[PDB]
Coordinates of C-alpha atoms in Angstrom, one line a residue:
Chain A
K1 CA 0.0 0.0 0.1
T2 CA 2.5 2.7 1.2
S3 CA 5.9 2.0 -0.6
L4 CA 7.7 5.2 0.4
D5 CA 7.2 7.6 3.3
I6 CA 10.1 10.0 3.9
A7 CA 10.5 13.3 5.6
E8 CA 13.4 15.9 5.8
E9 CA 13.9 19.4 7.0
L10 CA 15.4 21.8 4.5
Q11 CA 16.7 25.3 5.2
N12 CA 17.6 28.1 2.8
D13 CA 20.7 30.4 3.2
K14 CA 18.7 33.0 5.4
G15 CA 17.3 30.5 7.9
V16 CA 13.8 29.9 6.6
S17 CA 13.1 26.2 7.1
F18 CA 10.6 23.8 5.6
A19 CA 9.6 20.2 6.4
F20 CA 8.9 18.0 3.4
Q21 CA 7.3 14.6 3.3
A22 CA 7.3 12.4 0.2
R23 CA 4.7 9.5 0.2
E24 CA 4.1 6.9 -2.5
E25 CA 1.0 4.7 -2.4
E26 CA 0.0 1.7 -4.6
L27 CA -3.8 1.5 -5.4
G28 CA -4.3 -1.4 -7.7
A29 CA -3.5 -0.2 -11.2
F30 CA -2.8 3.3 -9.9
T31 CA 0.2 4.8 -8.0
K32 CA -0.3 8.1 -6.0
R33 CA 2.6 10.3 -5.1
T34 CA 2.0 13.1 -2.6
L35 CA 4.3 15.9 -1.5
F36 CA 3.5 17.5 1.8
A37 CA 5.1 20.8 2.8
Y38 CA 5.2 22.8 6.1
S39 CA 6.8 26.0 7.3
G40 CA 6.1 28.3 10.2
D41 CA 8.1 31.0 8.5
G42 CA 7.3 33.8 6.0
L43 CA 8.7 34.0 2.4
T44 CA 9.4 37.2 0.6
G45 CA 10.5 35.3 -2.5
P46 CA 11.6 31.9 -3.7
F47 CA 12.8 29.2 -1.2
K48 CA 15.9 27.5 -2.4
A49 CA 17.7 24.7 -0.4
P50 CA 19.7 21.5 -0.8
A51 CA 17.5 18.4 -0.9
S52 CA 18.4 14.7 -0.3
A53 CA 19.1 12.7 -3.5
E54 CA 16.1 10.6 -2.6
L55 CA 13.7 13.6 -2.2
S56 CA 15.1 15.0 -5.5
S57 CA 14.4 11.7 -7.3
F58 CA 10.8 11.8 -6.1
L59 CA 10.3 15.4 -7.1
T60 CA 11.8 14.8 -10.6
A61 CA 9.2 12.0 -11.2
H62 CA 6.1 14.2 -11.6
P63 CA 4.6 14.1 -15.1
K64 CA 4.7 17.9 -15.1
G65 CA 8.3 18.0 -13.8
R66 CA 7.3 20.2 -11.0
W67 CA 4.5 20.4 -8.2
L68 CA 1.8 22.9 -8.1
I69 CA 0.8 23.3 -4.4
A70 CA -1.7 25.3 -2.5
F71 CA -0.9 27.0 0.8
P72 CA -3.4 28.9 2.8
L73 CA -2.1 32.3 1.6
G74 CA -0.9 31.7 -1.8
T75 CA 0.2 29.2 -4.5
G76 CA 3.6 27.7 -5.0
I77 CA 5.5 25.5 -7.5
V78 CA 8.1 23.0 -6.2
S79 CA 10.9 21.8 -8.5
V80 CA 14.5 20.4 -8.2
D81 CA 17.6 20.8 -10.2
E82 CA 20.8 19.1 -9.3
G83 CA 19.8 18.5 -5.6
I84 CA 18.5 22.0 -5.0
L85 CA 14.8 22.3 -4.3
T86 CA 13.1 25.6 -5.4
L87 CA 9.6 26.7 -4.3
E88 CA 8.5 29.7 -6.2
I89 CA 5.5 31.5 -4.7
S90 CA 2.8 33.6 -6.3
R91 CA 2.9 36.4 -3.8
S92 CA 4.9 37.1 -0.6
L93 CA 3.7 35.0 2.3
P94 CA 3.7 36.4 5.9
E95 CA 3.3 32.7 6.9
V96 CA 3.6 29.6 4.7
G97 CA 1.6 27.1 6.8
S98 CA 1.0 23.7 5.3
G99 CA -0.2 22.2 2.0
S100 CA 0.1 19.1 -0.4
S101 CA 0.3 18.3 -4.0
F102 CA -0.2 14.9 -5.5
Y103 CA -0.6 13.1 -8.7
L104 CA -2.1 9.7 -9.8
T105 CA -0.9 7.6 -12.6
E106 CA -1.7 4.1 -13.9
Chain B
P16 CA -4.1 -3.6 10.7
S17 CA -5.4 -0.9 8.4
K18 CA -8.1 1.8 9.0
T19 CA -8.8 2.1 5.3
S20 CA -12.0 0.2 4.3
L21 CA -12.2 1.4 0.7
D22 CA -9.5 2.7 -1.6
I23 CA -10.3 3.0 -5.4
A24 CA -9.0 4.9 -8.2
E25 CA -10.0 5.5 -11.8
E26 CA -9.2 7.7 -14.8
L27 CA -11.9 9.6 -16.7
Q28 CA -11.6 11.5 -20.0
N29 CA -14.1 13.9 -21.6
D30 CA -15.0 14.2 -25.2
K31 CA -12.3 16.8 -25.6
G32 CA -9.4 14.7 -24.3
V33 CA -9.2 16.4 -20.8
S34 CA -8.4 13.7 -18.3
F35 CA -8.8 13.4 -14.5
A36 CA -7.6 10.6 -12.0
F37 CA -10.1 10.3 -9.1
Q38 CA -9.6 8.4 -5.9
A39 CA -12.3 7.4 -3.4
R40 CA -11.2 6.6 0.1
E41 CA -13.1 5.4 3.2
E42 CA -11.3 5.4 6.5
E43 CA -13.0 4.0 9.7
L44 CA -12.0 6.1 12.7
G45 CA -14.0 4.4 15.5
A46 CA -17.2 6.2 16.0
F47 CA -16.5 8.2 12.9
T48 CA -16.0 7.4 9.3
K49 CA -14.2 9.8 6.8
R50 CA -14.9 9.6 3.2
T51 CA -12.5 11.5 0.8
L52 CA -12.5 12.3 -2.8
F53 CA -9.1 13.1 -4.3
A54 CA -8.9 14.5 -7.8
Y55 CA -5.9 15.3 -10.2
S56 CA -5.6 16.7 -13.7
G57 CA -2.6 18.1 -15.5
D58 CA -5.0 19.8 -18.0
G59 CA -6.8 23.0 -18.0
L60 CA -10.5 23.4 -17.8
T61 CA -12.4 25.9 -19.8
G62 CA -15.9 24.8 -18.5
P63 CA -17.4 21.7 -16.8
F64 CA -15.8 18.3 -17.0
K65 CA -18.2 15.5 -17.8
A66 CA -17.3 11.8 -18.2
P67 CA -18.8 8.3 -17.3
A68 CA -17.8 7.0 -13.8
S69 CA -17.9 3.5 -12.5
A70 CA -20.9 2.2 -10.6
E71 CA -18.6 2.1 -7.5
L72 CA -17.4 5.6 -7.8
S73 CA -20.9 6.9 -8.7
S74 CA -22.2 5.3 -5.4
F75 CA -19.4 6.8 -3.4
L76 CA -20.2 10.2 -4.9
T77 CA -23.9 10.0 -4.3
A78 CA -23.5 9.2 -0.6
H79 CA -22.3 12.7 0.4
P80 CA -24.6 14.5 2.8
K81 CA -24.8 17.4 0.5
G82 CA -25.2 15.2 -2.6
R83 CA -22.1 16.8 -4.2
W84 CA -18.4 17.5 -3.4
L85 CA -17.0 21.1 -2.8
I86 CA -13.4 20.8 -3.7
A87 CA -10.5 23.2 -3.7
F88 CA -7.8 23.2 -6.4
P89 CA -4.8 25.5 -6.3
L90 CA -6.3 28.1 -8.8
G91 CA -10.0 27.7 -8.1
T92 CA -13.0 25.9 -6.5
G93 CA -15.0 23.0 -8.0
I94 CA -18.2 21.0 -7.4
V95 CA -18.2 17.3 -8.2
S96 CA -21.5 15.5 -8.6
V97 CA -22.8 12.4 -10.4
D98 CA -26.1 11.7 -12.3
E99 CA -26.9 8.4 -13.9
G100 CA -23.3 7.4 -13.8
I101 CA -21.9 10.6 -15.4
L102 CA -19.6 12.5 -13.2
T103 CA -19.6 16.4 -13.6
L104 CA -17.0 18.8 -12.2
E105 CA -18.1 22.4 -12.4
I106 CA -15.4 25.0 -11.8
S107 CA -15.6 28.6 -10.3
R108 CA -13.4 30.1 -12.9
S109 CA -11.5 28.9 -16.0
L110 CA -8.4 27.1 -14.9
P111 CA -5.1 27.0 -17.0
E112 CA -4.2 24.0 -14.9
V113 CA -6.4 22.0 -12.5
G114 CA -3.6 20.3 -10.4
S115 CA -4.7 18.3 -7.4
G116 CA -7.2 18.6 -4.4
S117 CA -9.3 16.7 -2.1
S118 CA -12.9 16.9 -0.5
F119 CA -13.9 14.9 2.5
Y120 CA -16.6 14.6 5.1
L121 CA -16.8 12.9 8.5
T122 CA -19.8 11.1 9.7
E123 CA -20.7 9.2 12.9
Chain C
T9 CA -0.3 2.7 13.1
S10 CA -1.5 6.4 12.9
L11 CA -3.3 7.6 16.2
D12 CA -6.7 9.4 15.6
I13 CA -9.0 11.5 17.7
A14 CA -12.4 12.3 16.1
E15 CA -15.4 14.2 17.4
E16 CA -18.3 16.4 16.5
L17 CA -18.6 19.9 18.0
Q18 CA -21.7 22.2 17.9
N19 CA -22.0 25.9 18.9
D20 CA -25.0 27.6 20.5
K21 CA -26.5 28.3 17.2
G22 CA -26.5 24.7 15.8
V23 CA -23.5 25.0 13.5
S24 CA -21.7 21.6 13.5
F25 CA -18.1 20.6 12.8
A26 CA -16.4 17.3 12.8
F27 CA -12.7 17.2 13.5
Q28 CA -10.2 14.4 13.1
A29 CA -6.8 14.9 14.8
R30 CA -4.1 12.4 13.4
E31 CA -0.7 11.8 14.7
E32 CA 1.8 9.9 12.6
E33 CA 5.5 8.9 13.1
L34 CA 8.0 9.1 10.2
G35 CA 11.3 8.1 11.8
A36 CA 12.7 11.2 13.6
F37 CA 9.7 13.2 12.4
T38 CA 6.2 13.4 13.9
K39 CA 3.4 14.7 11.7
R40 CA 0.2 16.0 13.3
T41 CA -2.7 16.8 11.1
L42 CA -6.1 18.5 11.9
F43 CA -9.0 17.6 9.5
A44 CA -12.0 19.8 9.8
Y45 CA -15.5 19.5 8.1
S46 CA -18.7 21.5 8.2
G47 CA -21.7 21.6 5.9
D48 CA -22.8 24.9 7.5
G49 CA -22.1 28.5 6.8
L50 CA -20.3 30.7 9.4
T51 CA -20.7 34.4 9.7
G52 CA -18.1 34.9 12.5
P53 CA -16.0 32.5 14.8
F54 CA -17.2 29.0 15.7
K55 CA -16.8 28.4 19.4
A56 CA -17.6 25.1 21.1
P57 CA -16.4 22.9 23.9
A58 CA -13.9 20.3 22.8
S59 CA -12.6 17.0 24.4
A60 CA -9.5 17.1 26.7
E61 CA -7.9 14.9 24.1
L62 CA -8.6 17.1 21.1
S63 CA -7.5 20.3 23.2
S64 CA -4.3 18.7 24.2
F65 CA -3.5 17.8 20.5
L66 CA -4.4 21.3 19.4
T67 CA -2.2 23.0 22.1
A68 CA 0.8 21.0 20.8
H69 CA 1.2 23.0 17.7
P70 CA 4.4 25.1 17.7
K71 CA 2.5 28.2 16.7
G72 CA -0.1 27.5 19.4
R73 CA -2.9 27.6 16.8
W74 CA -3.7 26.0 13.4
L75 CA -3.8 28.1 10.1
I76 CA -6.2 26.1 7.9
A77 CA -7.5 26.6 4.3
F78 CA -11.0 25.9 3.4
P79 CA -12.4 26.2 -0.1
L80 CA -13.8 29.6 0.4
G81 CA -11.5 31.1 3.0
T82 CA -8.9 30.7 5.6
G83 CA -9.3 29.9 9.4
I84 CA -7.2 29.7 12.6
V85 CA -8.2 27.0 15.0
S86 CA -7.0 27.5 18.8
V87 CA -8.2 26.2 22.2
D88 CA -8.4 27.9 25.5
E89 CA -9.6 26.1 28.6
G90 CA -11.2 23.3 26.5
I91 CA -13.1 25.7 24.3
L92 CA -12.2 25.4 20.6
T93 CA -12.3 28.5 18.5
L94 CA -12.2 28.7 14.7
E95 CA -11.8 32.2 13.4
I96 CA -12.3 32.9 9.8
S97 CA -10.8 35.4 7.3
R98 CA -14.1 36.1 5.6
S99 CA -17.7 34.9 6.2
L100 CA -18.3 31.5 4.6
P101 CA -21.6 30.5 3.1
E102 CA -20.3 26.9 3.2
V103 CA -17.2 25.8 5.2
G104 CA -16.6 22.5 3.5
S105 CA -13.4 20.6 4.3
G106 CA -9.8 21.3 5.0
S107 CA -6.7 20.2 6.8
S108 CA -3.7 21.7 8.6
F109 CA -0.6 19.9 9.6
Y110 CA 2.9 20.4 10.9
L111 CA 6.0 18.2 10.9
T112 CA 8.7 18.4 13.3
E113 CA 12.0 16.4 14.2

């Protein structure tokens, strides 16, 4: 059922930190991959931080090559490039809070 | 042991090639049961999405206390309903990309 | 494996919410998620007595409250002396469902 369930804390160069969880679930013919993201901090601009090789692999796997994600106060896109995660945001966020983004594939 | 008593998924496509994956899950939490609809599309939606659903998905969708599913996507809001095995998703605004979202209810 | 608290709260005006509070372990990480559902509308804040167990769970958030997105607006859930308060960003003709979590190690 659940074949991957990993979590890690990432921090950018100015001390903003995020917890990310990557979950993979098998549902008969379908596989579901969910990215969960949490930060108590605000973001003025994009969040860029080194990510584990395993989280990077998971992020790369998305059919869109990136992860559109809703937070309470705005929208983000999560991507990875050479082990650096980037979360770009639609507007500055005084607090990020929590959100998730998934896809299903068969 | 698992709390998940139902976990089904299916892919729907409309006459215009837009496609959605839907997952229906039921989780038993003692006195309460949660039923969740998960929806995903990489496509945009100009207007409502209509496609045939399985008998199982249709039954799950019908069971909601409101008779339909208010659902948040990143760029707008939808209502998912079913009528004679045709699923309809109506959207609040046109969406350049739908992305993912979920809608649940809890019942005792 | 996950641990859940679930209950239905009602205010003095008949608005009802269901809450599920889930705790999950992911190695060095703990994830706590609050799930909230109401089919009702809300003009202003929802206030109702909550169980000691839900109150305890709610208090554990590092921010001391739960920023939560519903389809039509944002809320903050807090607890004070076993009374749950959900404050909302704008009036909601229908609350719907939403969830709020944190993960910490």
